């Protein structure tokens, strides 16, 4: 590339294509006809190269439309869930000081492989429903098997979180394990700085993973960081309430991935 | 004689609404130098003592609706058909705001289809008088309500134009005359007028914080005066007063507030618009539109109870106008049934009621819960990749109308959902906006609403779905398949519209016309009863009784009856055996001895004094099962 300006502004132009009249695309979906017509210069082969140089931006969908995960709507939709009881959902938080550049578009791109049950071709496939948005994703195989991986903001906390919610079932545990493994792979390969074990921090890293539990349904969720649940699963298999040593919850429902459940 | 009407003012987001009314009312003070945009509807009433030979001193009330789009969800409650409607140009932005009027005029047509509308320019000091061209070109008599007169008052100050506008208002109010009735000067009993007088007098003797009045207080006031009303006169008297806007009372049994009476309507209307104006610019932990119980003397519960009753609570207004991208599992042009409801504009209170009708229906395919994501114009309640329903809202390319695309799977569990959502939308549309689904034999038969069904012969890869009007497709009931000009390939009717054919019902009620022999034309097989619509026939080799329906019973009503009849199944109740089209019939068991009344009339000796006990036992068993099914028989 002898002209960096041309490349940078081509990427900018693909990131800023807008069409009047509110067409049938939800924000973040573009059609090849729209992008070709939007650029005032209707080139013939450079258009093909431009649609082919998006190995960096615009994933192909159905060979006629393009997804742009960096231009999707940033308004979190009002989304409900089948189950809402504290004993029917497993919630895993990923507290971070900030979201790195490109984090929420890499996570979506990684999460667009469809085989958490087909096991990479052991079974054919199981296509779920999807509700893409710039800060989250929702996958739905059944009212018993689903996954919601989306950003969350807490009261009086300047940090950012990655609340993952799955049903408290066997398929929910499978989805939680798969999603946690993929997110850990993404954090290891592309953003090692958040996983960097600072010696000056004395065993403290920018990323802190919490599991939310509730001894009695209806009460507020309590947070335990996973670096303690690992030892508590090394000792036993149950988590005990210090105030009342009778309310015991297994580690098969707060974090099944720790005990290979 | 009764002399009282409603002069409603209509317009958008800042115009001569609260300014024009001041000189229209000739309010000299105008103390507020800079007033704010209206919150609520700002009910007011002003008499017009006409200084002419006629002395009808009519008093009429103006409801100048708020123009901001955030209050648009509650306006269609107060759009009655006994009123005169105004409109305001804001002629400063000429040739542009006239187009902006069109949603308001369309809503007026949808709600009050037979009321005149008067358009009023509210700017002369600024600018652009070519707007009257477009008002005479496309806004005059094209689907829009019956425009009567148009004016161009300066609004800021009184003038000859304003006087002409006032005279025009007088003439149109005194010549309302819907279906030749002359409403403005109709005759009513004096008891209604006396009740109105005492109500408007007592309006000033109620607490400001809570003018709501119980029915006990009303029965007290009727006792204190000398009215001649009884328990049988109040349900019509208060309804007539409500139609005149003196006090708002609601007669819907489902919304449990009919005990309360809302005198001083402006207070209720202002309270209704308080929740729509509160916000929070802090931490967005909740998505835009959802809200929970957050902040006097026990009034807090009544507030959101009233909001839920009006279905304003989750706030359907200001609810995530941008929709997130949805990627359905099977979209190969053959597993999805799609239907469209092309209409020129979306009526004001359409989506906030629609997404509040399908929302509360959790027991679909019957109790499991559906995932759901709400936006300002959609629901998309989905259970699984093989069971879902997407009620969207898009605009087609090179199309100025507004569409309601419902997408459903074509499998077993999809027909039920499609028929259950189509029924709800049709019921809402005919219950809230009767002016839309109104036939127009005069002129072209547009009907404003064209319900299309989408079908493609090719099993996928058709690249486009052919439209088909639902009425033209309905008239094609002679056969069971649809086919193009090249009839080598064809599509079953069930796959593209399983609500016209009785497919969303359980399949054990199939008509099975092949094995049914039945002679409708002769009357000697009509012998069941006397001069009834039930005939005797044979189905499946067994004697049965069929019930031919006349043209009165619509398909939707018949389906709504069958869906509840099919799930009853008791040995003491007549059980359905089949139902179908060509003609709209209904097969049931044949009672060999006929009804009991004929036997009591002519065969009084046949009862062996212990059959009189068996009949009672069987009827008691039937009544017990019916009352166990939470249905009341009401006519035995
Ligand atoms: N399955 C049946 N077997 C025998 N007789 C029947 C059966 N169903 C109805 N009948 C009788 O046939 C007649 C039908 O009466 P029906 O219920 O149609 O009356 P209706 O609703 O008042 O009238 P319509 O609908 O014609 O205005 C009655 O005399 C009834 O007893
Ligand atoms: N300059 C000018 N201003 C006007 C005229 N008519 C109305 N206005 C302004 O419009 C405002 C009226 O607000 P209004 O539309 O009634 O509030 P809304 O009903 O909630 O939209 C007033 O504050 C006036 O200043 C006019 O003829 N000339």
Numbering used by the authors:
A (entry chain C): 1597 to 1652, 1658 to 1862
B (entry chain E): 1331 to 1457, 1463 to 1630, 1642 to 1659, 1668 to 1720, 1726 to 1995
Paper text:
With a ~205 Å by 260 Å by 150 Å dimension, the Rab29–LRRK2 tetramer is an assembly with a twofold rather than fourfold symmetry, featuring two types of LRRK2 protomers: LRRK2peri (peripheral) and LRRK2cent (central). In addition, LRRK2peri directly interacts with LRRK2cent from the other asymmetric unit, with regions near the LRRK2peri ARM–ANK boundary packing against the LRRK2cent WD40 domain and the LRRK2peri ARM domain associated with the LRRK2cent ROC domain. The two LRRK2cent protomers pack in a “head-to-tail” mode through WD40–KIN interfaces. The catalytic halves of LRRK2cent and LRRK2peri show substantial conformational differences. The KIN domain of LRRK2cent has structural features of an active kinase. Critically, the LRRK2cent KIN domain adopts a closed conformation, with the αC helix positioned toward the active site and the “DYG motif’ flipped in. Lys1906 and Glu1920 form a salt bridge, an interaction blocked by Tyr2018 in the inactive conformation. There is a well-defined cryo-EM density for ATP in the active site, and the distance between Asp2017 and ATP shortens to 3.8 Å (from 13.8 Å in the inactive state), permitting ATP hydrolysis in the presence of substrates. LRRK2 activation features a striking dimer-of-asymmetric dimer assembly containing two active core subunits encased by two inactive peripheral protomers. The formation of active tetramers is Rab29-dependent because such an assembly was not observed with Rab32 or without Rab29 under similar experimental conditions.
